[PDB]
């Protein structure tokens, strides 16, 4: 049955989904703030993650202002990071809207489509497959580009 | 293709969609406020609408505090209001979240599934079919249960 679930992710924490995200489902992260002038990351300023049942990082979205790039990657929980995909000009991806932002991920089965507000910044070919059982938003209190609490909304049972 | 579109609807206005919403698509209205003590409507306090290309109300969602009900209906532009589907106890539907709210509409072709926050309030069997080409949020700045501006986010091209 189609459903909507809402989660409040505080910076530096994760949440387990009550309804898993699989092929055809959607997850949108909402930030009630946007600080594109934050200091240097360590190396990341902000990261958004979708975890599989087995603990794998299905999709890792990392925003690095200092390197002016958004990174997309995957990795096993006990393995190394795999092949990174990069999008240049972080600030430009959020152009049009200020004071807040929205990041959407579509699980298309063999790929993850990431959209910043209304702009699809990448069709990321999966390096690791499976359904998402957990999410996390990692960042410090001083250098995150998003608010202290990031809200995640999932639309599941779509297919 | 799958896409995300954002619209800011000021009370009493409507917007034409850049991407029409059809079977398998989703639209969520976000309110940055929630006043269940707004007072008696005239008769409605707030309405959210999905219009067909010809102006027909495909889905009319009316929040009526004085009657303590949420009304769902449809009608042709020159026709009478059709059969109302009433959900009682407005406060219960928004329970769990204060200060704001979100109303989601799933277009399943034969029905419109409406979800307030995480709670599915109705599986509205359509009385009129067709694609949604426009949306509206109607209310006065005096008695609306939502903020002056409501943001509509559509997820289209899903099917
Ligand atoms: C800290 C950092 O920026 N890490 C990113 C890394 O950048 C490389 C250097 O970092 C190390 C690391 O700690 O991972 C340094 C280690 O000594 C290296 N290990 C070994 C055995 O040599 C690793 C290793 O080379 C990579 O992991 C291989 O992929 O890299 C980083 O210090 C260096 O920074 C430059 C800087 O850009 C330049 O301006 C300055 O003048 O010199 C500095 C030092 O040379 O750049 C290195 C090359 O990139 O690069 C990897 C990708 O290759 C990652 O981006 C890594 O960050 C992780 O990325 C993950 C997602 O892919 C995830 O976001 C993690 O949270 C990140 O830490
Ligand atoms: C103003 C209102 O509440 N309208 C809703 C209506 O309420 C009925 C009475 O309103 C009329 C009307 O103007 O529509 C009065 C007309 O004289 C009636 N027409 C005829 C030919 O008799 C119509 C007609 O019966 C209906 O349209 C048929 O569906 O109804 C309203 O005055 C009456 O008020 C009661 C009050 O509810 C009660 O608490 C109080 O103690 O006594 C009052 C006087 O008796 O209540 C009537 C209830 O039927 O009812 C219809 C549904 O039957 C709608 O709810 C209508 O509101 C419209 O709803 C639409 C969606 O379905 C849409 O949201 C429109 O914007 C609403 O105006």
Curated annotation (Swiss-Prot), chains A, B:
Parts forming coiled coils: none
InterPro entries according to UniProt: ConA-like_dom_sf, Galectin_CRD
Domain Galectin: 13-156
UniProt KW keywords: Apoptosis, Hydrolase, Lectin, Nuclease
E.C. numbers: 3.1.21.-
GO terms (BP aspect): apoptotic process; positive regulation of apoptotic process
Residues bearing PTM Blocked amino end (Gln): 2
Binding locations of N-acetyl-alpha-neuraminyl-(2->3)-beta-D-galactosyl-(1->4)-beta-D-glucose: 44, 60, 64, 73, 75, 81, 84
Tissue expression summary: Detected in the fruiting body.
GO molecular function: DNA nuclease activity; polysaccharide binding
Function as written in the Swiss-Prot or TrEMBL entry: Anti-tumor lectin with DNase activity. Inhibits the growth of several tumor cell lines in vitro. Induces lymphocyte infiltration and necrosis of tumor cells in a mouse tumor model. Induces apoptosis in HeLa cells. Binds N-acetylneuraminyl lactose (N-acetyl-alpha-neuraminyl-(2->3)-beta-D-galactosyl-(1->4)-beta-D-glucose).
Subunit structure as annotated in this protein's UniProt entry: Homodimer.
Record protein name field: Anti-tumor lectin
């Amino acid at each position: 049955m189609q459903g909507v679930n809402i989660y409040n992710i505080s910076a530096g924490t994760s949440v387990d989904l009550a309804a898993p995200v699989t092929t055809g489902d959607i997850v949108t992260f909402f930030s009630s703030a946007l600080n594109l002038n934050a200091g240097a990351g360590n190396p990341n300023n902000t990261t958004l993650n979708l975890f599989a049942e087995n603990g794998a990082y299905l999709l890792h979205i990392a925003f690095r202002l200092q390197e002016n790039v958004i990174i997309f990657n995957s990795r096993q929980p006990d393995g190394p990071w795999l092949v990174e995909q990069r999008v240049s000009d972080v600030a430009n991806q959020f152009a049009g809207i200020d004071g807040k932002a929205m990041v959407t991920v579509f699980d298309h089965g063999d790929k993850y489509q990431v959209v910043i507000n209304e702009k699809t910044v990448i069709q990321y070919t999966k390096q690791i497959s499976g359904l998402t059982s957990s999410l996390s938003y990692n960042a410090t209190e001083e250098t995150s580009i998003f608010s202290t609490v990031v809200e995640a909304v999932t639309y599941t049972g779509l297919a």
